[PDB]
Design an enzyme around this catalytic site. Structure first.
Site, PDB file in Angstrom:
ATOM      1  N   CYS A   1      92.592  24.173  35.624  1.00  0.00           N
ATOM      2  CA  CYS A   1      92.492  24.379  37.081  1.00  0.00           C
ATOM      3  C   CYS A   1      93.521  25.342  37.605  1.00  0.00           C
ATOM      4  O   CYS A   1      94.712  25.057  37.573  1.00  0.00           O
ATOM      5  CB  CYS A   1      92.539  23.049  37.886  1.00  0.00           C
TER       6      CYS A   1
ATOM      7  N   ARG B   1      95.914  24.403  41.207  1.00  0.00           N
ATOM      8  CA  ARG B   1      96.764  23.203  41.216  1.00  0.00           C
ATOM      9  C   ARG B   1      98.008  23.257  42.117  1.00  0.00           C
ATOM     10  O   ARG B   1      98.607  22.240  42.344  1.00  0.00           O
ATOM     11  CB  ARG B   1      97.151  22.792  39.797  1.00  0.00           C
TER      12      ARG B   1
ATOM     13  N   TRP C   1      88.099  24.187  47.476  1.00  0.00           N
ATOM     14  CA  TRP C   1      87.390  25.371  48.001  1.00  0.00           C
ATOM     15  C   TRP C   1      87.264  26.464  46.916  1.00  0.00           C
ATOM     16  O   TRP C   1      87.937  26.402  45.909  1.00  0.00           O
ATOM     17  CB  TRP C   1      88.059  25.924  49.232  1.00  0.00           C
TER      18      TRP C   1
HETATM   19  C1  HEM Z   1      91.675  23.599  46.211  1.00  0.00           C
HETATM   20  C2  HEM Z   1      90.966  24.618  45.701  1.00  0.00           C
HETATM   21  C3  HEM Z   1      90.664  24.717  44.200  1.00  0.00           C
HETATM   22  C4  HEM Z   1      90.418  25.865  43.549  1.00  0.00           C
HETATM   23  C5  HEM Z   1      90.444  27.312  44.119  1.00  0.00           C
HETATM   24  C6  HEM Z   1      90.159  25.534  42.185  1.00  0.00           C
HETATM   25  C7  HEM Z   1      89.853  26.466  41.235  1.00  0.00           C
HETATM   26  C8  HEM Z   1      89.254  26.147  40.043  1.00  0.00           C
HETATM   27  C9  HEM Z   1      88.527  27.036  39.177  1.00  0.00           C
HETATM   28  C10 HEM Z   1      88.243  28.522  39.470  1.00  0.00           C
HETATM   29  C11 HEM Z   1      88.210  26.328  38.081  1.00  0.00           C
HETATM   30  C12 HEM Z   1      87.402  26.770  36.844  1.00  0.00           C
HETATM   31  C13 HEM Z   1      85.963  26.529  37.305  1.00  0.00           C
HETATM   32  C14 HEM Z   1      84.944  27.249  36.502  1.00  0.00           C
HETATM   33  O1  HEM Z   1      85.188  28.395  36.048  1.00  0.00           O
HETATM   34  O2  HEM Z   1      83.872  26.649  36.333  1.00  0.00           O
HETATM   35  C15 HEM Z   1      88.705  24.972  38.253  1.00  0.00           C
HETATM   36  C16 HEM Z   1      88.589  23.958  37.349  1.00  0.00           C
HETATM   37  C17 HEM Z   1      88.923  22.633  37.524  1.00  0.00           C
HETATM   38  N1  HEM Z   1      89.537  22.067  38.641  1.00  0.00           N
HETATM   39 FE1  HEM Z   1      90.041  23.137  40.281  1.00  0.00          FE
HETATM   40  N2  HEM Z   1      90.262  24.173  42.010  1.00  0.00           N
HETATM   41  C18 HEM Z   1      90.522  23.610  43.245  1.00  0.00           C
HETATM   42  C19 HEM Z   1      90.634  22.247  43.528  1.00  0.00           C
HETATM   43  C20 HEM Z   1      90.483  21.206  42.613  1.00  0.00           C
HETATM   44  C21 HEM Z   1      90.457  19.793  42.902  1.00  0.00           C
HETATM   45  C22 HEM Z   1      90.548  19.194  44.323  1.00  0.00           C
HETATM   46  C23 HEM Z   1      90.343  19.129  41.746  1.00  0.00           C
HETATM   47  C24 HEM Z   1      90.301  17.585  41.502  1.00  0.00           C
HETATM   48  C25 HEM Z   1      90.895  16.773  42.414  1.00  0.00           C
HETATM   49  C26 HEM Z   1      90.240  20.104  40.704  1.00  0.00           C
HETATM   50  C27 HEM Z   1      90.155  19.833  39.361  1.00  0.00           C
HETATM   51  C28 HEM Z   1      89.644  20.705  38.442  1.00  0.00           C
HETATM   52  C29 HEM Z   1      89.193  20.358  37.113  1.00  0.00           C
HETATM   53  C30 HEM Z   1      89.194  18.958  36.397  1.00  0.00           C
HETATM   54  C31 HEM Z   1      88.737  21.652  36.503  1.00  0.00           C
HETATM   55  C32 HEM Z   1      88.141  21.833  35.058  1.00  0.00           C
HETATM   56  C33 HEM Z   1      86.653  21.537  35.163  1.00  0.00           C
HETATM   57  C34 HEM Z   1      85.893  21.690  33.851  1.00  0.00           C
HETATM   58  O3  HEM Z   1      86.442  21.559  32.734  1.00  0.00           O
HETATM   59  O4  HEM Z   1      84.662  21.927  33.932  1.00  0.00           O
HETATM   60  N3  HEM Z   1      90.357  21.359  41.249  1.00  0.00           N
HETATM   61  N4  HEM Z   1      89.404  24.923  39.418  1.00  0.00           N
HETATM   62  C1  LIG Z   2      80.086  21.092  28.720  1.00  0.00           C
HETATM   63  C2  LIG Z   2      81.087  21.483  29.775  1.00  0.00           C
HETATM   64  C3  LIG Z   2      82.368  20.909  29.821  1.00  0.00           C
HETATM   65  C4  LIG Z   2      83.274  21.296  30.821  1.00  0.00           C
HETATM   66  N1  LIG Z   2      84.517  20.729  30.869  1.00  0.00           N
HETATM   67  N2  LIG Z   2      82.874  22.236  31.736  1.00  0.00           N
HETATM   68  C5  LIG Z   2      81.623  22.808  31.704  1.00  0.00           C
HETATM   69  C6  LIG Z   2      81.171  23.853  32.705  1.00  0.00           C
HETATM   70  O1  LIG Z   2      81.979  23.806  33.885  1.00  0.00           O
HETATM   71  C7  LIG Z   2      81.211  23.713  35.082  1.00  0.00           C
HETATM   72  C8  LIG Z   2      82.053  24.304  36.219  1.00  0.00           C
HETATM   73  C9  LIG Z   2      83.194  23.377  36.621  1.00  0.00           C
HETATM   74  C10 LIG Z   2      83.021  23.068  38.110  1.00  0.00           C
HETATM   75  O2  LIG Z   2      83.673  23.895  39.091  1.00  0.00           O
HETATM   76  C11 LIG Z   2      85.086  24.098  39.058  1.00  0.00           C
HETATM   77  C12 LIG Z   2      85.707  24.012  40.470  1.00  0.00           C
HETATM   78  C13 LIG Z   2      85.994  22.736  40.922  1.00  0.00           C
HETATM   79  C14 LIG Z   2      86.596  22.516  42.155  1.00  0.00           C
HETATM   80  C15 LIG Z   2      86.862  21.084  42.564  1.00  0.00           C
HETATM   81  C16 LIG Z   2      86.896  23.604  42.972  1.00  0.00           C
HETATM   82  C17 LIG Z   2      86.584  24.902  42.505  1.00  0.00           C
HETATM   83  N3  LIG Z   2      86.876  25.965  43.297  1.00  0.00           N
HETATM   84  N4  LIG Z   2      85.982  25.078  41.298  1.00  0.00           N
HETATM   85  C18 LIG Z   2      81.576  23.433  38.398  1.00  0.00           C
HETATM   86  N5  LIG Z   2      81.250  24.433  37.408  1.00  0.00           N
HETATM   87  C19 LIG Z   2      80.712  22.437  30.717  1.00  0.00           C
END
Ligand code: HEM
Ligand SMILES: Cc1cc(N)nc(COC[C@@H]2C[C@@H](OCc3cc(C)cc(N)n3)CN2)c1
Ligand code: HEM
Ligand SMILES: Cc1cc(N)nc(COC[C@@H]2C[C@@H](OCc3cc(C)cc(N)n3)CN2)c1
Ligand SMILES: C[C@H](O)[C@H](O)[C@H]1CNc2nc(N)[nH]c(=O)c2N1
Ligand SMILES: C[C@H](O)[C@H](O)[C@H]1CNc2nc(N)[nH]c(=O)c2N1
Ligand SMILES: [Zn+2]
Lengths: 411, 407
Positions: free
Chosen positions: A108, A111, A280
């Site tokens: 993320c 963070r 967002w």
């Molecule tokens: C506040 C604005 C936030 C921004 C701009 C942001 C940005 C991002 C981005 C760009 C990714 C990668 C997503 C992708 O490429 O699919 C991500 C992943 C992630 N974020 Fe954030 N995030 C935000 C808030 C949060 C919040 C509120 C949470 C949980 C409380 C969170 C938890 C996670 C987690 C667990 C991932 C990894 C997801 C995965 O493995 O698929 N984020 N974030």
């Molecule tokens: C199999 C698999 C595992 C794994 N950990 N992740 C994926 C694909 O990721 C899907 C992404 C993660 C989610 O979005 C990230 C995100 C989350 C939040 C809370 C905010 C933000 N700006 N962006 C939705 N699309 C696939």
């Protein structure tokens, strides 16, 4: 032991001690790195250690480590586990846990915001209709008419694994995808399988390019149920370009609220299988991935055509040129409509400041480079040049398998 | 023990078995991934020799033959008596090609089997090294039709008689810290430039001064030589639409030629083994030109484009980046100097990966290095899971010689 990371642009070297607290595994070994691999019912015996580790961290964070209150709480949880085979978190522990799962999320980039998270406690929820109501309230709170606020809603924890709460949607708001008889896809190809499930369960599909999917909600291990999010709660942004007037006629839009609904939250050994969370957008998530992946909306060609770029050879960099204009459009559009969005330069710069702060105050910041570096203009962002250490801290968000693969259908 | 990698764009899944033959360690553990970290006697030598000759004899379908058992015997005998051994020309060539084949950070490996190997093991002096290197430069350059080559100097003996090219690449530009506080030329090369001046080089003190070679033979003190200017092919940078672009005064060299790495083959170490290919356009236009600690030209370009530099969200940096990279490719192509764009190169690497999985059981790849530094997810490698592991023969980092050399 001390591990060092270097920034190859600034020569700032940081020292990690926090990695001494990881225990879950990475996928990697001394012989193989799996850093680019996407995916590399408990017993009483395993549970109290996990509880104790968590409560020790919580009590340390509030500067009450080894207090009567800490010791009484350990005894209380111990007894609850031996007698009921599980335990309930106090509200304060739940909030701390959910915040830390975000702080610990190595993929993320956002963070810096981790300590500002609104936690909605939905552990009194019992039915899918109850879940629908909680989710609408989350969406309305988080959306805040475009001034987005991060939030998480936490449904009851796993018990025997036969009574799980699940949101079957991968995000609360996402567009339908329909596979056509001719092999083309209408709408979002990422959501075809889920769309077919919704249709099967009785959803009347509009069959357009941006149809907001219904929620499919499972309470207490029951068969899931369909609900439509009130359209007035779903904030959307039509995409236009500041200089290119034809951009609007591509008919593109996107939703304002990114809300992950398919992950599992672990706090102190307890498993929250339904815990939708939202923040967002960073503009590239939409402009680069959602619009330009070949397996998503795939708009690069149409954009390049309209721009009249030389498309006969990749070396004209027409794809790169159209990609930048699409991303300008997304940021311009969200900003013009006063919907919170961050660009990849701002977000990565804030992430580096967050990371350096975490190193100084916490002794580390686990980070997954593969995911942190944006999918365009990588090396012109400071994170490209930053060495990172990836490791697993709890509380945590984890992947779980899609529920249609595991659900025991009742009838 | 058998591992799968998936492409998330095409759903194609490949099975890796080659990682079991991996020998050296990655830096990672079960607790911690170091995937983004830049740098994570007799009795030892015979196992290493045997491991290599077995793969070599297997490669020419003669495994377990008398000629195989005879060579193992001969090498065993030679190590026993001399504490080292010498490779046959066939073995040296195979080893060098395979070191490239095994280079997990190289996107261009589809080319691995077309490597011209120049055997310089008969070299004894720095003047000899200079001759070999000019010959390599001229051969590889081939008037703009570039050909991959490596020149291999004598192997390490006791470690006090090392051959080294002190330069990081055969062709690079000087960097000079100025009284002003800024840096003139390439900031990457400030320290090496100083060493050159110290050893006697008369620096022209310009923005694009080709460094002299600093060559060390037989563990002797290194000596200076200028590469004949007429052998250094360079390209002035212009843009197909922006006529002002040429006024920036930018140029780059045609020949990327790494000269500071160590080739290990069958336990033998070749500490001077300069090797060269041709450029992928992003290496120059994204990294050499736009890194903040390199030529750092983004601002100047953006200003000439008259972009709104008020806010990062106008994506002025991204716009100027693409244009700089368009200009790099157009310039090389117009002057007929071989270059590959990042779309072509990564498409080729995906094909190569599928070939290596099909024919060899895997392909070690470092995703962090393979995905280009711009437009990552619009290239197919972004969506390709890769496994990273170390196979020998290999190219390895070694410390810069000035830290190690005793004068
Ligand atoms: C506040 C604005 C936030 C921004 C701009 C942001 C940005 C991002 C981005 C760009 C990714 C990668 C997503 C992708 O490429 O699919 C991500 C992943 C992630 N974020 Fe954030 N995030 C935000 C808030 C949060 C919040 C509120 C949470 C949980 C409380 C969170 C938890 C996670 C987690 C667990 C991932 C990894 C997801 C995965 O493995 O698929 N984020 N974030
Ligand atoms: C199999 C698999 C595992 C794994 N950990 N992740 C994926 C694909 O990721 C899907 C992404 C993660 C989610 O979005 C990230 C995100 C989350 C939040 C809370 C905010 C933000 N700006 N962006 C939705 N699309 C696939
Ligand atoms: C023929 C065209 C070639 C292309 C297009 C190419 C492409 C590249 C690129 C883009 C990089 C990353 C460079 C960087 O970002 O600094 C790289 C790294 C590397 N390549 Fe190649 N390469 C080619 C030929 C060769 C040859 C001929 C060899 C050896 C015989 C080689 C071995 C290596 C090694 C060892 C690395 C990693 C160097 C390091 O870790 O610093 N490549 N390659
Ligand atoms: C042979 C070749 C072809 C081609 N198209 N491009 C190249 C670029 O590699 C040349 C040098 C070697 C690389 O050095 C970066 C580096 C720095 C450090 C401190 C360690 C390390 N392993 N690698 C990047 N530029 C090399
Ligand atoms: C195979 C590879 O790990 C995969 O394509 C990853 C790479 N990096 C990513 N980074 C982000 N932020 N999001 C992603 O979906 C991915 N996908
Ligand atoms: C810290 C990080 O490993 C470093 O900036 C890397 C990332 N990927 C790279 N990739 C390539 N091809 N070349 C590089 O120099 C780097 N640098
Ligand atoms: Zn790893």
């Amino acid at each position: 032991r001390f591990l060092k990371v270097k920034n190859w642009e600034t020569d700032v070297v940081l020292t990690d001690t926090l990695h001494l607290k990881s225990t879950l595994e990475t996928g990697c070994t001394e012989h193989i790195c799996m850093g680019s691999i996407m995916l590399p019912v408990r017993t009483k015996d395993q549970l109290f250690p996990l509880a104790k580790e968590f409560l020790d961290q919580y009590y340390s964070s509030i500067k009450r480590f080894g207090s009567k209150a800490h010791m009484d709480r350990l005894e209380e949880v111990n007894k609850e586990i031996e007698s009921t085979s599980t335990y309930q978190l106090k509200d304060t522990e739940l909030i701390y846990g959910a915040k830390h799962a975000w702080r610990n999320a190595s993929r993320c980039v956002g963070r810096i915001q981790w300590s500002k998270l609104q936690v909605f406690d939905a552990r009194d929820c019992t039915t899918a209709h109850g879940m629908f109501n909680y989710i609408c309230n989350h969406v309305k709170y988080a959306t805040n008419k475009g001034n987005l606020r991060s939030a998480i809603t936490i449904f009851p924890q796993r018990t025997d694994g036969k009574h799980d709460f699940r949101v079957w949607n991968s995000q609360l708001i996402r567009y339908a995808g329909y596979k056509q008889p001719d092999g083309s896809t209408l709408g979002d190809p990422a959501n075809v399988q889920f769309t077919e499930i919704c249709i099967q369960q009785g959803w009347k599909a509009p069959r357009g390019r941006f149809d907001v999917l219904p929620l499919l909600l499972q309470a207490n291990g029951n068969d899931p149920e369909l609900f439509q999010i009130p359209p007035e709660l779903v904030l959307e942004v039509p995409i236009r370009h500041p200089k290119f007037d034809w951009f609007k006629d591509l008919g593109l839009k996107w939703y304002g609220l990114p809300a992950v609904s398919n992950m599992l939250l672990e706090i102190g050994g307890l498993e929250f299988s339904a815990c939708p969370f939202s923040g967002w957008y960073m503009g590239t998530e939409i402009g680069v991935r959602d619009y330009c992946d070949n397996s998503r909306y795939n708009i690069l060609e149409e954009v390049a055509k309209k721009m009249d770029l030389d498309m006969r050879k990749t070396s004209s960099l027409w794809k790169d040129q159209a990609l930048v204009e699409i991303n300008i459009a997304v940021l311009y559009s969200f900003q013009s409509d006063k919907v919170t969005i961050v660009d990849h330069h701002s977000a990565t710069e804030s992430f580096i400041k967050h990371m350096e702060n975490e190193y100084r105050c916490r002794g580390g910041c686990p980070a997954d480079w593969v995911w942190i570096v944006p999918p365009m203009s990588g090396s012109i962002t400071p994170v490209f040049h930053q060495e990172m250490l990836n490791y697993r801290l709890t509380p945590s968000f984890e992947y779980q398998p899609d529920p249609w693969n595991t659900h025991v259908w009742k009838g």
